[PDB]
Amino acid sequence: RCKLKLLRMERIKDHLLLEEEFVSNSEILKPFEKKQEEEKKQLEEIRGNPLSIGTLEEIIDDDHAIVTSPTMPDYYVSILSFVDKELLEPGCSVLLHHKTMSIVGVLQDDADPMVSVMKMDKSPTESYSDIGGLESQIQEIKESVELPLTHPELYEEMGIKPPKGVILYGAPGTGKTLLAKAVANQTSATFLRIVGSELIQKYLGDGPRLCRQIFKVAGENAPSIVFIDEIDAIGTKRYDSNSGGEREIQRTMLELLNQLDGFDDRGDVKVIMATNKIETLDPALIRPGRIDRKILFENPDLSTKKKILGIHTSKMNLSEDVNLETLVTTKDDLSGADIQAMCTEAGLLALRERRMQVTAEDFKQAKERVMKNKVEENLEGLYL
Amino acid sequence: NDKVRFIKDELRLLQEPGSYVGEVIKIVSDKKVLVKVQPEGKYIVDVAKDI
Amino acid sequence: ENDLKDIEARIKEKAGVKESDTGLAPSHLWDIMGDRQRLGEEHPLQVARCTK
Numbered sequence: 001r002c003k004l005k006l007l008r009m010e011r012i013k014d015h016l017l018l019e020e021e022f023v024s025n026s027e028i029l030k031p032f033e034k035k036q037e038e039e040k041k042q043l044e045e046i047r048g049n050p051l052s053i054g055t056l057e058e059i060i061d062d063d064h065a066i067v068t069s070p071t072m073p074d075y076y077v078s079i080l081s082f083v084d085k086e087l088l089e090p091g092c093s094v095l096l097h098h099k100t101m102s103i104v105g106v107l108q109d110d111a112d113p114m115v116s117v118m119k120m121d122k123s124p125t126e127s128y129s130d131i132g133g134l135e136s137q138i139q140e141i142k143e144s145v146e147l148p149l150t151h152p153e154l155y156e157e158m159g160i161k162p163p164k165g166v167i168l169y170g171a172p173g174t175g176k177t178l179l180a181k182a183v184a185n186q187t188s189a190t191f192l193r194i195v196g197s198e199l200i201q202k203y204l205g206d207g208p209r210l211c212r213q214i215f216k217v218a219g220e221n222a223p224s225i226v227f228i229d230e231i232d233a234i235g236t237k238r239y240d241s242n243s244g245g246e247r248e249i250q251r252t253m254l255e256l257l258n259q260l261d262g263f264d265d266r267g268d269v270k271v272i273m274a275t276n277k278i279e280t281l282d283p284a285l286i287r288p289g290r291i292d293r294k295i296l297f298e299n300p301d302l303s304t305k306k307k308i309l310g311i312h313t314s315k316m317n318l319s320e321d322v323n324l325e326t327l328v329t330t331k332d333d334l335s336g337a338d339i340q341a342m343c344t345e346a347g348l349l350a351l352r353e354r355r356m357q358v359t360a361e362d363f364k365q366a367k368e369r370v371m372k373n374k375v376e377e378n379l380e381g382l383y384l
Numbered sequence: 385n386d387k388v389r390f391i392k393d394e395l396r397l398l399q400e401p402g403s404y405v406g407e408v409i410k411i412v413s414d415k416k417v418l419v420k421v422q423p424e425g426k427y428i429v430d431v432a433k434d435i
Numbered sequence: 436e437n438d439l440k441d442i443e444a445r446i447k448e449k450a451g452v453k454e455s456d457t458g459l460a461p462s463h464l465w466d467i468m469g470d471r472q473r474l475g476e477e478h479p480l481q482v483a484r485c486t487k
């Protein structure tokens with residue numbers, strides 16, 4: 001707390017920006033200047049009234065093109081050609097003229113709802129060291145993901161190509177998921193995130209087109225980091241066996257090889273893969289130079305858990321009663337998602353009370369519920 | 385008189401060129417609207433003075 | 436804090452956005468004989484295919 005003054009200060013910078021912006025738009029945006037008036041005039045004189053969306057199939061280098069409209073009929077259209085002869089390419093949306101169809105203009109951009117799944121609006125409210133602990137196997141993910149974006153200068157002293165690629169692997173719950181989302185808050189470059197259960201589809205032929213796409217968008221914006229979460233999901237998830245099966249899975253893998261490195265020479269696509277089925281992947285996937293430093297994660301050790309548990313209980317109410325050290329004693333090489341589920345379930349004990357204090361009793365009780373999960377899908381009791 | 389001059393006026397009113405239903409996909413800040421006509425495709429077209 | 440969230444939305448909304456409809460600065464006159472490609476058709480064409 002005690003940050004009220006700085007938030008008011010930020011707010012105050014916001015008041016001033018909203019104000020001057022608004023008045024500037026209002027009436028002193030003066031379009032009584034001829035370089036505004038005369039440019040729009042004779043621009044609208046060739047520009048429509050109905051603007052007849054078309055789809056450009058291909059161009060001809062005689063100032064013509066063949067469009068196919070979604071309404072139906074094709075047309076062999078001219079081009080007014082103050083629009084830069086060579087700036088438009090197959091797949092463009094073009095403005096045709098309501099009279100003789102000429103390319104009045106060209107729309108710069110258009111998008112799909114299938115790339116909406118890919119792209120993101122988010123801005124995580126967690127930044128790194130809410131991944132506090134495991135703090136030397138995270139120098140392998142911020143020296144080959146973060147750093148060459150931040151400094152290419154270091155890799156120029158040595159020269160040769162800079163890093164490319166990582167595969168994260170280890171036990172589930174050991175932070176793989178949050179590692180990827182934590183470098184993306186630092187770097188502030190286009191963060192794509194795609195689940196591997198959407199790369200597996202119940203329809204064929206569109207599988208490869210999806211996988212081919214991710215990196216083509218990704219190269220198109222000059223920096224991007226593509227998180228493929230769960231590439232362990234490509235051999236264990238499958239729908240029907242007559243449009244899924246071996247075939248679907250083989251093709252998509254094949255596509256990814258060309259995309260990941262292949263012959264495309266696409267833009268920067270730093271890749272992050274989470275997996276714990278690394279032996280269901282190709283040898284041309286886990287091939288070096290697409291994985292450069294690969295990171296192994298195992299369960300923390302006793303003193304590492306102390307780092308983990310203190311991160312989690314800072315958000316909570318505390319007392320002098322609370323003792324973190326004896327919660328550590330009980331657990332023995334377990335995940336940090338287990339530790340994280342004790343602190344989440346400790347406030348569920350406080351919720352149950354409707355008492356806003358968190359005490360050593362609440363942490364020990366949820367410890368027992370957490371250990372109830374581990375050994376009661378077990379039915380041996382003692383190792384038979 | 386109110387009655388007979390309402391009929392005579394409705395004869396004009398009923399005569400149309402066709403007036404459609406569209407739906408706005410998105411605007412563009414040239415003061416134009418991309419409208420997908422529900423049966424038909426998309427056309428960027430200007431707007432009236434009442435909107 | 437809620438005032439911070441509101442004012443960012445308001446600044447963006449009032450400022451407005453822009454989406455280019457391509458032109459070229461090395462062009463400012465095109466309609467001296469652009470209207471011959473326009474308005475007085477010379478002509479754009481329905482594309483077909485020979486079958487016989």
Ligand SMILES: Nc1ncnc2c1ncn2[C@@H]1O[C@H](COP(=O)(O)OP(=O)(O)OP(=O)(O)O)[C@@H](O)[C@H]1O
Binds near residue numbers: 133
């Ligand atoms: N080493 C750690 N340091 C700090 N926090 C941790 C650590 N390990 C786990 N956590 C906490 O536990 C969380 C739950 O982790 P997450 O769901 O990201 O784990 P995971 O390993 O990605 O799980 P899965 O095995 O299902 O893929 C994180 O969101 C994180 O805050």
Ligand SMILES: [Mg+2]
Binds near residue numbers: 176177229
């Ligand atoms: Mg995960």
